[PDB]
């Protein structure tokens, strides 16, 4: 779902660019200003990424913990299944 959303965003840009190009050709306003602002707002992320890296590490650790918990419950389930099988055999 996230991917589809991202694609939609990029799609707008692509189409937007095409429109701009055509617009310029014809010319040869507000939208332009808006675009400029967006531009000013990955490059910058570079320095910001430094921090993101630290936070990514934290959220990786959390995921690992969750995985462990899941494994625990999984083991219990397996044990239960085994017990059931044994009971059936006895019957």
């Amino acid at each position: 779902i996230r991917l589809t959303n991202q694609l939609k965003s990029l799609k707008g840009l692509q189409s937007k660019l095409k429109d701009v190009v055509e617009y310029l050709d014809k010319v040869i306003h507000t939208i332009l200003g808006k675009l400029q602002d967006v531009f000013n707002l990955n490059n910058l992320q570079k320095a910001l990424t430094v921090k993101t890296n630290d936070e990514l590490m934290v959220i990786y650790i959390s995921n690992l913990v969750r995985s462990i918990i899941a494994f625990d419950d999984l083991i219990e389930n397996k044990i239960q299944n085994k017990k059931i099988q044994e009971q059936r055999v006895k019957d």
Partner: protein
Amino acid sequence: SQLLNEWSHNVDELLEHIETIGHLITKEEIMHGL
């Protein structure tokens, strides 16, 4: 934590900017006809 709160504020600004641009593009389309 400080840099994190700035990063996700930046992201939220960038998003809004994109939305505006998109909307603007729509308006431009109408101008094209003009």
